[PDB]
Amino acid sequence: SSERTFIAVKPDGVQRGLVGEIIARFERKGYKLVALKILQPTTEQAQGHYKDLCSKPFFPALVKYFSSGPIVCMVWEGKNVVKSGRVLLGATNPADSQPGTIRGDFAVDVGRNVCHGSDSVESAEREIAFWFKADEIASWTSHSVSQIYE
Amino acid sequence: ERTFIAVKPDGVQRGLVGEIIARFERKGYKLVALKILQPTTEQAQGHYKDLCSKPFFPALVKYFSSGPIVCMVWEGKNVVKSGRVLLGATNPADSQPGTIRGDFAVDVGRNVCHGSDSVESAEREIAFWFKADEIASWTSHSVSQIYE
Amino acid sequence: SSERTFIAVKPDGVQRGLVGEIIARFERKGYKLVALKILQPTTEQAQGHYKDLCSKPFFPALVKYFSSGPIVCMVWEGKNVVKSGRVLLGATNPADSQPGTIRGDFAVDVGRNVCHGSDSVESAEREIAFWFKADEIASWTSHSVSQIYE
Amino acid sequence: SSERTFIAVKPDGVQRGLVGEIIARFERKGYKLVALKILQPTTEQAQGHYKDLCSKPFFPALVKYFSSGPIVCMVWEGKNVVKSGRVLLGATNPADSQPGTIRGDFAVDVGRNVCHGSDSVESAEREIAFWFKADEIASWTSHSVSQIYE
Amino acid sequence: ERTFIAVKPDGVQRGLVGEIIARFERKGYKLVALKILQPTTEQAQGHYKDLCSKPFFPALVKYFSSGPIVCMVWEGKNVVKSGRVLLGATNPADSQPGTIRGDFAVDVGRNVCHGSDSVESAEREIAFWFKADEIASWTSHSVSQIYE
Ligand SMILES: Nc1ncnc2c1ncn2[C@@H]1O[C@H](COP(=O)(O)O)[C@@H](O)[C@H]1O
Ligand SMILES: Nc1ncnc2c1ncn2[C@@H]1O[C@H](COP(=O)(O)O)[C@@H](O)[C@H]1O
Ligand SMILES: Nc1ncnc2c1ncn2[C@@H]1O[C@H](COP(=O)(O)O)[C@@H](O)[C@H]1O
Ligand SMILES: Nc1ncnc2c1ncn2[C@@H]1O[C@H](COP(=O)(O)O)[C@@H](O)[C@H]1O
Numbered sequence: 001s002s003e004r005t006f007i008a009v010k011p012d013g014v015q016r017g018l019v020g021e022i023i024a025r026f027e028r029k030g031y032k033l034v035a036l037k038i039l040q041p042t043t044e045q046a047q048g049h050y051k052d053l054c055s056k057p058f059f060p061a062l063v064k065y066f067s068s069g070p071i072v073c074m075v076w077e078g079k080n081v082v083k084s085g086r087v088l089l090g091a092t093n094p095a096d097s098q099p100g101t102i103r104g105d106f107a108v109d110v111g112r113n114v115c116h117g118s119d120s121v122e123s124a125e126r127e128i129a130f131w132f133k134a135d136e137i138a139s140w141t142s143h144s145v146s147q148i149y150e
Numbered sequence: 151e152r153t154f155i156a157v158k159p160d161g162v163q164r165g166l167v168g169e170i171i172a173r174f175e176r177k178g179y180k181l182v183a184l185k186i187l188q189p190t191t192e193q194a195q196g197h198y199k200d201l202c203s204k205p206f207f208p209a210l211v212k213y214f215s216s217g218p219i220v221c222m223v224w225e226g227k228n229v230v231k232s233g234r235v236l237l238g239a240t241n242p243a244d245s246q247p248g249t250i251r252g253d254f255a256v257d258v259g260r261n262v263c264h265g266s267d268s269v270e271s272a273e274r275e276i277a278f279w280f281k282a283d284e285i286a287s288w289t290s291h292s293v294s295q296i297y298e
Numbered sequence: 299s300s301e302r303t304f305i306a307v308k309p310d311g312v313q314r315g316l317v318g319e320i321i322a323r324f325e326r327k328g329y330k331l332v333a334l335k336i337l338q339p340t341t342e343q344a345q346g347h348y349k350d351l352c353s354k355p356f357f358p359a360l361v362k363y364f365s366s367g368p369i370v371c372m373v374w375e376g377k378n379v380v381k382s383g384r385v386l387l388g389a390t391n392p393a394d395s396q397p398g399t400i401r402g403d404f405a406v407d408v409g410r411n412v413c414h415g416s417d418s419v420e421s422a423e424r425e426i427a428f429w430f431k432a433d434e435i436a437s438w439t440s441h442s443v444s445q446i447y448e
Numbered sequence: 449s450s451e452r453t454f455i456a457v458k459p460d461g462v463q464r465g466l467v468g469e470i471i472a473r474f475e476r477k478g479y480k481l482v483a484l485k486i487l488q489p490t491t492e493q494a495q496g497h498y499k500d501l502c503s504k505p506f507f508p509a510l511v512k513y514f515s516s517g518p519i520v521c522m523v524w525e526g527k528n529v530v531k532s533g534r535v536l537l538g539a540t541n542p543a544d545s546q547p548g549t550i551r552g553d554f555a556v557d558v559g560r561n562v563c564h565g566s567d568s569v570e571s572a573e574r575e576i577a578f579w580f581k582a583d584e585i586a587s588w589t590s591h592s593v594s595q596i597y598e
Numbered sequence: 599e600r601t602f603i604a605v606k607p608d609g610v611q612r613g614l615v616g617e618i619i620a621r622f623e624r625k626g627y628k629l630v631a632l633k634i635l636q637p638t639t640e641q642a643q644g645h646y647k648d649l650c651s652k653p654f655f656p657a658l659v660k661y662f663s664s665g666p667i668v669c670m671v672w673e674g675k676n677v678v679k680s681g682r683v684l685l686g687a688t689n690p691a692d693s694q695p696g697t698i699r700g701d702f703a704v705d706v707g708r709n710v711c712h713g714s715d716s717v718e719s720a721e722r723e724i725a726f727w728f729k730a731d732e733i734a735s736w737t738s739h740s741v742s743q744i745y746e
């Protein structure tokens with residue numbers, strides 16, 4: 001329940017006006033917003049974010065797109081956020097995603113797949129650590145914590 | 151790629167035209183043809199040519215012709231496959247919440263909407279329903295946010 | 299009572315994927331769809347429709363705007379649809395528009411004001427004669443009439 | 449003009465899961481997110497922000513409240529965002545608020561009134577300077593600007 | 599304060615119950631009682647006491663007893679006045695979008711829902727429709743988020 005995950009609205013998501021929608025679905029799922037900001041990534045911020053993918057053929061086109069406009073970074077906290085965050089976002093390739101998920105409802109191409117979520121806790125610690133200073137992460141208690149968790 | 155999508159008479163009656171169009175809009179697809187009309191007997195029959203041997207066929211044809219449908223064409227990369235996924239499984243009883251039939255329907259006989267099963271059936275229903283006259287050619291300002 | 303009105307989502311409304319949102323609003327209200335099409339207006343159509351105001355300084359830009367891409371035209375039928383239709387759209391200038399109306403929720407610029415409604419009965423017969431083949435207007439009965447009207 | 453406004457989800461807004469809904473209304477309206485932040489104000493930030501109200505009797509409860517947990521600060525850019533942002537939000541006192549506005553749909557008590565928007569372009573510049581480093585402010589062009597502004 | 603809200607027979611037929619309940623929840627008010635019954639004629643007459651003078655009175659009474667309604671009772675500071683602001687003007691033609699009658703209704707004879715005029719009318723409508731032990735006593739875990 002101390003578990004955190006990192007979520008990003010990619011440039012296509014911000015451009016397309018989906019930021020509110022993505023945040024509302026995490027809110028209503030019962031997860032806690034703990035960090036939040038908007039920036040345009042430099043390409044080195046890009047390369048470092050996608051380290052897991054540096055060896056892939058699509059890596060430069062991805063780094064090029066990710067660094068091309070403002071993204072919104074966010075940190076979410078809760079029992080199982082990482083796994084659920086990924087469930088909420090739907091398959092990485094939209095073509096595989098079910099209606100009801102972010103990509104399922106909103107995306108068509110894996111190059112414009114709207115949003116990003118850490119694939120594991122560990123990646124999450126890394127991506128949280130990479131984008132936010134520890135001074136940037138608020139610490140609070142949801143008044144509904146006990147309506148949501150046992 | 152293009153697909154034919156229709157809201158059947160039960161969907162028009164139940165005020166779901168706007169909802170189904172919003173989900174195609176919000177998915178990134180591009181609307182290109184549009185109209186509302188009560189099909190004749192003939193039009194129903196001819197529309198469903200591929201199910202003439204089925205036993206539910208005449209109930210089907212009479213139902214499709216009892217009121218307005220709304221026909222549409224949507225244009226996009228994979229619209230046909232993706233249009234069917236949006237609508238949900240044909241028999242609502244197998245449809246997942248999140249889909250049109252999943253949120254909105256109970257009975258395969260009142261399953262709210264129709265979508266072309268393949269590109270060949272798509273080009274045929276489009277041409278069955280629309281004159282070239284009526285199909286708009288335009289470029290969405292958002293193409294580069296949706297496709298690579 | 300009557301009565302029919304003409305609604306068009308204009309090129310900015312069509313580009314911003316607001317077509318369904320507008321239709322749903324007239325549906326939830328209880329009104330009846332009777333005609334529907336998507337077309338790019340020719341410059342001459344635009345002028346025919348904005349005819350009453352050929353002598354406006356803004357008219358040439360309107361005309362140019364209104365025919366720069368596809369609009370969605372509609373006909374709605376029911377007691378007091380003309381007035382009640384203008385109410386759903388909100389005031390012509392989006393700055394005077396209350397939230398909850400179409401323009402209130404979606405527009406900023408008169409001139410990029412998302413949608414048009416007939417200003418009166420007379421105007422609605424003029425607009426519906428203009429844009430629609432009268433032998434292509436559905437006539438059907440809503441299974442819910444006695445739920446919507448006394 | 450293109451003006452900027454500062455909007456702030458207060459602590460009750462955050463606790464009630466209303467951050468997404470609010471952001472989404474500014475998006476659908478056509479305005480542009482330019483800075484975003486989640487932090488718990490200090491007792492000193494709270495006075496700073498509400499400085500021109502220090503004399504009113506509720507100020508101490510206000511200030512305590514405002515600093516009782518996290519807020520979400522934002523900056524929005526667009527022609528009229530200040531006038532419009534107040535309109536979207538609704539009367540400061542929710543009892544005077546109309547359904548359709550944030551306070552109208554969501555709030556009951558002026559002391560728990562969900563969110564805050566600059567009362568003027570003058571005050572927006574004070575609020576924006578106060579909460580955001582000028583480099584916390586993205587600079588970017590929406591792909592839709594021509595659809596929203598004529 | 600408490601008020602009485604009823605979704606009328608047109609509101610129920612048209613599936614607006616949830617919509618209506620959700621608008622009260624999101625505002626912050628606390629649901630305290632709830633039932634579906636078809637009103638008897640006597641019950642309709644009784645509820646509509648004050649309006650016995652009106653030429654529309656027999657229509658209303660026939661109508662309000664023609665199907666099930668949904669009765670509710672809501673609690674919170676200022677619910678009586680705010681309940682009615684959420685409903686919209688009594689005549690939908692005067693209603694603004696954003697309100698229940700503004701978004702959903704066209705005709706005053708089918709104005710979807712009812713809310714109490716005043717605290718005395720609410721206290722009256724609540725004893726008429728509800729027995730005292732149909733009325734739950736609880737405390738929202740959010741009471742502090744809504745009231746100072
Ligand atoms: N052009 C492309 N071809 C194939 N896969 C891609 C392409 N662009 C991006 N990807 C995917 O982008 C994902 C990167 O993580 P995420 O930020 O979750 O989208 C990878 O898992 C890739 O499969
Ligand atoms: N009464 C029925 N019993 C069984 N299947 C039906 C019945 N009515 C319609 N169908 C189905 O209707 C579908 C036709 O395509 P669509 O235009 O999507 O409805 C077929 O896949 C049939 O299985
Ligand atoms: N540049 C402009 N300046 C002022 N008013 C405009 C401008 N462009 C369009 N309009 C308005 O557009 C309206 C036309 O109505 P509609 O069919 O609803 O778009 C008129 O009432 C004008 O006031
Ligand atoms: N207890 C209270 N009584 C009256 N007004 C209040 C009270 N608490 C807060 N306010 C209002 O809070 C407003 C502050 O502006 P805003 O940041 O827009 O909420 C003031 O104008 C006051 O009207």
Ligand SMILES: Nc1ncnc2c1ncn2[C@@H]1O[C@H](COP(=O)(O)O)[C@@H](O)[C@H]1O
Binds near residue numbers: 448654657658706707
């Ligand atoms: N001509 C009419 N036909 C039916 N109902 C009417 C008519 N004129 C007014 N009403 C209203 O029907 C309403 C029903 O009350 P309410 O509980 O607010 O729905 C009354 O408040 C009357 O004002």
